[PDB]
Subunit: 173 residues, 4 copies
């Protein structure tokens, strides 16, 4: 296995600001733990963050959120990115759509994505879908992901994306 | 509005054959009804059908199904395509991934996709996501789509893709 | 016609710095003129600039150039982007690959791309190619584009991408 | 190295039929030679053939050619595909655009594409670009490719895509 960690939407507006929830806050400790081990082990860490324009397709659905330029779209300080970490702006749910995520994964010979962040129903899941199409294996760190609407999310990942589910305190590296 | 109809995985495998959902049969009369009205009105009809190779990414998850060359991957006779419905082979959940769906829709000036077929909560849903990404409006025909795992699938479409839900017996054309 | 202006790689390293040429310098006046008219007319202006990582595929070919973070990848001051202009980072020759260029064009209902910048042999041409695949019409402003290796570039655009060639002092708006 | 052979537009239209280059005939013996060695060695062989609709973007440029359903879009008998060579229909210059080429290459763990067919300076070249974007190494077989407009095509491949150029009678397998 050669994995990269993809950290989805761990940004101020969903953790600290206007759309903050406790489910979201609960992810921060575990996320820092997962991020830290990947770094200490030299493997790629990639942040993929909403950085929306007013006319992005999904703005009609949600209204303005995690806008480009506004501090809402910035990664929370708790897991501030370091030198060597990749930071990507995205305009749709999936971390792959309109981004160079796939490039970075291919350039570092990656065959497995480890997914954490916000959230199990929308962006994490959508990123997972695209990973599958592109023949990556998928791992999700349950305690580092927050649900929104679906309580059967874990089941969906496993049954539909063949994902294996782990906890932050586990590490196959 | 200028819509195209995208007919997802109405193949023998998902209807009559092996992986068929129980309510999957019930979509066939509504699907024929929707397809017919689109045809009678000159608008594009596109069939997107799993046509798998043994090493497609999702084979490890589901095992062999709707394989290229085998009759399981063939559109059911009830709604046999005419010339010139478009018939596309796909290798992943989304009707857009690795296909020329978007080309067809762009070439015919389309701004709205009308979605029917199987599964409501998998291929139809993954087709909807990629439609949203590409700035198409989305319509799902509730009685021409079959769910598999999620019973809250209608809610997901509307809340996550801003889709509007219609019945086969309705027509805004 | 509803056009957007795509301004390719008008960045310091190719105009002012390490890979500066007079062909390149010659584009600046005309580019400012084209950019200005688009702005004065409310139509979208999109800068697409190399912002490379060390391991981008093309770095093996060219060595480091227009690197992310370094002033070489910054747009020249002469045509500094304004409020409302879009500024995109790209990692390959085409302005579309791994970017949200197509999103912006679709969100603003665009059907024609007007191409200027660096250069007619590589990035402008590659961007043109992708525009074609995505069913845009193509216009190139000859005096606002610099050749590198091919002297028959104008012929290639017209014969292969069906591009129409204009001069900066002309305007169909 | 783990290579796949991509065989571009060796169809009746480009060889025997209407738009055929004069030296296009001369590629057929080398192409068969390259194809045969790949087969004898178990490596993937993928045919990518124009299979146009009347409203594909390039029809306005070239007029009708290599149309879907017409024998002009059929692979020449000299190098008839076997089972299981992959045979892909494409609608644009690049063998990647709107196709599942990348899926096949990824599923077979490929890191290098070997390119033959027509035209050296159009479809073969546009296939090379998209290969570079996707971090594949590139090999062109000079005698199994035919130029159309540009006589400096070999130089373009090497200088712009870092391609290495080989003859059909050579084999690094
Ligand atoms: Zn968002
Ligand atoms: Zn399937
Ligand atoms: Zn570059
Ligand atoms: Zn063609």
């Amino acid at each position: 296995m050669k994995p990269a960690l993809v950290v989805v939407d761990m940004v101020n507006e969903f953790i600290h600001g206007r759309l903050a929830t406790p489910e979201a806050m609960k992810t921060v400790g575990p996320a820092r733990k997962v991020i830290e081990t990947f770094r200490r082990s030299g493997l790629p860490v990639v942040y993929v963050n909403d950085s929306h324009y007013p006319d992005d397709p999904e703005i009609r659905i949600w209204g303005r959120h995690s806008m480009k330029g506004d501090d809402g779209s910035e990664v929370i300080d708790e897991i501030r990115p370091s030198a060597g970490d990749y930071v990507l702006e995205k305009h749709a749910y999936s971390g792959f759509y309109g981004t160079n995520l796939d490039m970075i994964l291919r350039a570092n010979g990656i065959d497995t994505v480890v997914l954490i962040g916000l959230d199990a129903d929308i962006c994490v899941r959508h990123t997972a879908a695209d990973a599958l199409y592109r023949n990556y294996r998928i791992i999700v760190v349950e305690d580092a992901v927050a649900a929104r609407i679906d309580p059967n999310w874990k089941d969906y990942f496993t049954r539909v994306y063949g994902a294996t589910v782990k906890r932050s305190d586990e590490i196959e590296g």
